Design a protein around this ligand. Structure first.
Ligand code: MG
Length: 278
């Protein structure tokens, strides 16, 4: 369960994924992305990933112990399925002068080596104008709070913005970094992945951390005013998924292969949004 926030912070959103084992997610908080694209969006979720997303509890369910499970599955015909859920809410944005923290505590799919090839878990945010549009990436803004591939002991955090390819945000790489999980591997158990959006200073800043340790900071002056405005002057929605294959795993050896093992969930204790007043 989420621990109490620090002094002065208020709760904006919390889903701690409590409920019986094998039961369905709270759809007051979450909506399902299904198939191989948004309705009228880019093919294969824009990444070349090979799974079809579903709303089945074979791919998205609770563990009964306070966690969401998103589990890639491979059927007897060789078809991959997985889960991709987004917050119903799109409003997350601190007021000017304020701060926001968006956080998840999760275990990355516990699989390494050849068996992990293609596994692409993610916990991320997309600018509200993307919803029902699907055609305004990267200008609309993307905050990747945790990404991982290949069961490697590291987390990537990235901001996407501006134009692609290139532009001030160096697309499609984005403004990002990777680091090992502190103390224990990312795959071994829970870690906390946090984005702090700080509108209390000039230049405005976004800081990504793992287990309370900051590894990537992005500041507004890294791009022009219009680019920052387009990327951040709106709410965001939150997304949790495990992609299978596509470009990110492709840059780290590829996958899935015949050796990739299905059935290793991303285990998410909670997603929480908190706010600090100006
Ligand atoms: Mg929980």
């Amino acid at each position: 369960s989420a621990p109490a926030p620090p002094s002065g912070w208020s709760q904006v959103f919390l889903d701690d994924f409590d409920g019986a084992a094998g039961s369905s997610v709270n759809t007051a908080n979450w909506q399902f992305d299904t198939g191989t694209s948004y309705p009228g969006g880019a093919g294969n979720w824009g990444t070349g990933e090979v799974e079809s997303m579903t709303s089945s509890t074979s791919n998205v369910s609770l563990d009964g112990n306070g966690d969401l499970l998103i589990t890639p599955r491979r059927d007897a015909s060789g078809n991959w399925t997985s889960g991709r859920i987004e917050t119903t809410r799109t409003d997350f944005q601190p007021p000017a002068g304020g701060k926001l923290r968006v956080e998840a505590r999760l275990q990355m799919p516990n699989v390494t080596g050849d068996a992990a090839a293609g596994y692409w878990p993610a916990f991320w945010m997309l600018g509200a104008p993307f919803r029902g549009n699907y055609q305004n990436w990267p200008g609309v803004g993307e905050l990747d709070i945790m990404e991982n591939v290949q069961g490697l002991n590291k987390t990537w955090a990235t901001m996407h913005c501006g134009t692609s390819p290139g532009g001030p945000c160096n697309e499609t790489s984005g403004i990002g970094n990777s680091t090992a999980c502190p103390n224990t591997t990312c795959q071994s158990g829970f870690h906390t992945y946090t984005m702090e959006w700080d509108r209390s200073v000039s230049p405005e800043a976004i800081r990504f951390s793992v287990d309370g340790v900051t590894y990537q900071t992005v500041t507004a002056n890294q791009m022009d005013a219009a680019t920052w405005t387009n990327a951040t002057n709106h709410g965001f929605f939150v997304i949790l998924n495990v992609a299978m294959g596509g470009g990110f795993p492709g840059a780290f050896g590829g996958g899935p292969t015949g050796a990739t093992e299905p059935g290793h969930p991303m285990v998410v204790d909670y997603v929480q949004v908190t706010s600090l007043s100006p």
